[PDB]
């Protein structure tokens, strides 16, 4: 108890004190470092200047015409103007990063607050000769930094298991990081392609160290504590037993206890269910695969006909799921997923700029390369497109209703293929294990050394 007006003045006074204090103890740090930095200056400057002494560099001497005048009446000078022999320049190119697959990209401090609170506190103590009127006075001089409440709270103010601080924890809390940050689709943590975090159903099918690992392992092994013993390492059948007692982009659907009918996201997006969906294995909307024995590049094969590459987990019979060490396989419909692109060469175009040339003969309808770049939203493409127009020039290509791929900052060599309305290549968007990817195909046979072109207009028409 001692007056609100009084306290507000103290707030204003201690704060203004502290501030002015930090201000000086900080003007000195500066002063300190300017000096002990200038010691470094002279220290290393000497080193150079000595390395300079040990040299005898030659003086420069004198030599179509050029002259220089003086604006201070000095005599004009005239000297011979030597020509530097021409040198050819290469076309313009802005910096870019190599990609072999698409890459997604999205669209009164606290230190002082505490000192002031403490300094105010010590006045409340010396008064009697973490209080409550103090926080109300501070909220009155800083109505913004929070209310009386938030300031009382702000003032007072993820396990690891292999470490010294392991806890006994839930199993779905030791596993939490792995479960949310893991992409079931491309088998990587915090992956570069798939923004929507994993569906909840997709990851379901004594010290901290030991107790936690116990609950994790029973959720997998259940009651066979014999094995839970082998894995927990330093316990036994028994001991465990005893512890027990005490065109739209594709996105996996997950609608528990409910069929894939017309309310289903996949069905509405007009997409098939994939192996990534959490629905009946008997789902009518899943795509089967094909039972081909080879080839897979004609309307005979349901995948090719559906404009999908083959799935190495459903197409068991054509070759798509085997021989991982070769890129040339029985199946001719998985060039994108294995990245079996053709050698490409970079040189200035015969039209303009840079162009791309194929290093070896390619056959009609043959895959050449995936057109790779950043995946960005239609919104980001708008932003970026304003910047790009200044350059009369752009490398955005629609992937689907939701995403554009932009080979401006990242992509592979095929982005040097120029545009033409009489192309020798075309672009086809395939569905590939749940990703839309752009494949570039030869439109006719093509010979060694030929320059590549396709017609950008068809990409540019997500009309």
């Amino acid at each position: 108890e001692k007056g609100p007006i009084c306290w507000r003045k103290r707030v204003k006074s201690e704060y203004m004190r502290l501030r002015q204090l930090k201000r000086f103890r900080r003007a000195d740090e500066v002063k300190s470092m300017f000096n002990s930095n200038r010691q470094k200056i002279q220290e290393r400057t000497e080193i150079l200047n000595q390395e300079w002494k040990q040299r005898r560099i030659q003086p420069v001497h004198i030599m179509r015409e050029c002259s220089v005048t003086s604006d201070l009446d000095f005599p004009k000078q005239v000297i011979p103007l030597k020509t530097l022999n021409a040198v050819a320049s290469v076309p313009i190119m802005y910096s870019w990063s190599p990609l072999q697959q698409n890459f997604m990209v999205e669209d009164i401090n606290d230190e002082i607050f505490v000192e002031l609170v403490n300094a105010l506190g010590q006045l409340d103590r010396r008064d009697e000769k973490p209080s409550d009127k103090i926080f109300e006075a501070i909220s009155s001089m800083f109505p913004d930094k929070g209310t009386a409440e938030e300031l009382k709270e702000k003032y007072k103010e993820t396990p690891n298991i292999d470490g010294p601080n392991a806890k006994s924890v839930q199993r779905e809390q030791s596993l939490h990081s792995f479960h949310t940050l893991f992409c079931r689709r491309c088998f990587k943590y915090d992956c570069f392609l798939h923004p929507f975090h994993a569906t909840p159903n997709t990851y379901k099918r004594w010290s901290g160290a030991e107790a936690s690992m116990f609950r994790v392992l029973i959720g997998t092994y259940y009651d066979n504590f014999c094995a839970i013993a082998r894995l927990i390492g330093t316990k036994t059948c028994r001991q465990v037993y005893e512890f027990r007692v005490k065109v739209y982009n594709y996105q996996p659907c997950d609608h528990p206890r409910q069929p894939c009918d017309n309310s289903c996201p996949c069905v509405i997006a007009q997409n098939f269910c994939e192996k990534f969906c959490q629905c009946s294995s008997e789902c009518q909307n899943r795509f089967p695969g094909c039972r081909c024995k080879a080839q897979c590049n004609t309307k005979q094969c349901p995948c090719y006909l559906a404009v999908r590459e083959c799935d190495p987990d459903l197409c068991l019979t054509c070759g798509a799921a085997d021989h991982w060490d070769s890129k040339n396989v029985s199946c001719k419909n998985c060039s994108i997923q294995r990245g079996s692109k053709k050698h490409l060469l970079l040189a200035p175009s015969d039209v303009a700029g840079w162009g791309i040339f194929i290093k070896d003969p390619v056959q009609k309808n043959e895959f050449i390369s995936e057109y790779c770049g950043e995946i960005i939203s239609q919104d980001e493409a708008d932003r970026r497109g304003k910047v790009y127009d200044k350059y009369m020039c752009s490398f955005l290509f629609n992937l689907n209703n939701d995403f554009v791929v932009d080979a401006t900052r990242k992509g592979n060599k095929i982005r040097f293929a120029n545009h033409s309305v009489n192309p020798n290549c075309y672009a086809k968007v395939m569905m590939v294990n749940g990703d839309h990817r752009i494949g570039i195909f030869a439109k006719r046979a093509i010979q060694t050394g030929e320059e590549l072109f396709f017609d950008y207009r068809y990409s540019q028409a997500d009309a």
Binding site: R56, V60, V68, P80
Partner: protein, 359 residues
């Protein structure tokens, strides 16, 4: 400082670059070089203000426009060497002793805004480009040691860069508002440099493998609020300017953090203070320093030339003198001290060169 001569080169084009030859032997006359339009010009400095015209080259190509130049030497021959480059993205090494263009490097995919030689190794050339990247060349062995750009390099044109005194790290700045630190004393980089001197094209079927450094050892967008067009080291502190009419002194990390223990994820910067001036809000205007880094000089868009004394305590008390002259009224693009500080040269939009002497 007193104004002691003013010159005008016939071509009437902006002069973007001036550099004294800090390799001139003790005793030899002070030489400096100028670049602008498609030309490179050399001058000898004498007393009572006489600036003597020594050499001038013109690019065969009318559409070349040189922005920058820099002096180095040849270890073996002891010749001075002048590198120049500009809007055609091409580096030429000139041998003023021989009137030869002896080397040239095509490669940058757009214009070259700055050029810097390594403080201790004459053969290492840093070039900074409008293509968004910098490149380190080894000009002895004609090889591209490293490209500094990529997923975490500059997102826009790079305007400037500078080695620190001993040649261990590079700092770069540009139009994306960013300043970035690139260490070249890492094992990777020193290995790449060693490797570059070994590369013999005649004894192999494969090209030299250039480093692709996509990641700076530190980057900040937090010093200036616009394009950053000049940066230099003052010690382990950085001096840098935008177009907000200040040169800003700052260091990466917090006040006590050591430039060399700073971590590539460091998000802190500390602003030590700044030098104020006016009417320098057009871009591509560059401040220069002494060899002994005792004083700093900047030129104006209306022709005023500022010189500070850096042997002080603070930017607050930073002693500033303003050189000025009825006849000098153009934008001063860049300045250059002689190795010893006796002379200060400034060059302008109007093709003019202004010589200021000391004492």
């Amino acid at each position: 400082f007193k104004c002691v001569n003013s010159l005008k080169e016939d071509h009437n084009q902006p002069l973007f670059g001036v550099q004294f030859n800090w390799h001139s032997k003790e005793g030899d006359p002070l030489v400096f070089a100028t670049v602008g339009s498609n030309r490179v010009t050399l001058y000898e400095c004498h007393s009572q203000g006489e600036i003597r015209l020594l050499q001038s080259y013109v690019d065969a190509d009318a559409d070349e426009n040189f922005y920058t130049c820099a002096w180095t030497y040849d270890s073996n021959t002891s010749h001075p060497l002048l590198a120049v480059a500009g809007s055609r993205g091409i580096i030429r090494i000139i041998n003023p002793i021989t009137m030869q263009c002896i080397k040239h490097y095509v490669g940058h995919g757009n214009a070259i805004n700055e050029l810097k030689f390594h403080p201790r190794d004459p053969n290492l050339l840093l070039s900074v480009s409008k293509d968004h990247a910098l490149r380190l060349w080894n000009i002895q062995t004609d090889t591209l040691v490293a490209i500094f750009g990529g997923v975490e390099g500059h997102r826009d044109e790079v305007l400037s860069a500078d080695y620190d005194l001993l040649g261990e790290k590079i700092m770069s700045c540009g139009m994306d508002h960013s300043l970035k630190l690139w260490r070249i004393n890492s094992k990777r980089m020193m290995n790449a440099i060693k490797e570059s001197y070994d590369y013999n094209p005649n004894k192999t079927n494969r090209p030299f493998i250039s480093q692709k450094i996509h990641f700076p050892d530190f980057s900040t967008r937090d010093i200036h609020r616009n394009y950053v067009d000049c940066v230099r080291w003052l010690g382990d502190l950085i001096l840098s300017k935008s177009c907000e009419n200040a040169i800003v002194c700052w260091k990466p990390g917090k006040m006590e953090d050591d430039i060399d223990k700073i971590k590539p994820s460091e998000s802190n910067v500390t602003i030590l203070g700044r030098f104020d001036y006016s009417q320098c809000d057009i871009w591509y205007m560059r401040f220069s320093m002494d060899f002994w880094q005792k004083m700093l000089a900047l030129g104006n868009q209306v022709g005023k030339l500022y010189v500070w004394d850096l042997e002080v305590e603070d930017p607050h008390k930073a002693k500033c003198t303003t050189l000025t002259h009825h006849k000098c009224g153009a934008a001063i693009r860049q300045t250059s001290f002689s190795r010893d500080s006796s002379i200060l040269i400034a060059v302008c939009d109007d093709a003019s060169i202004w010589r200021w002497d000391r004492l």
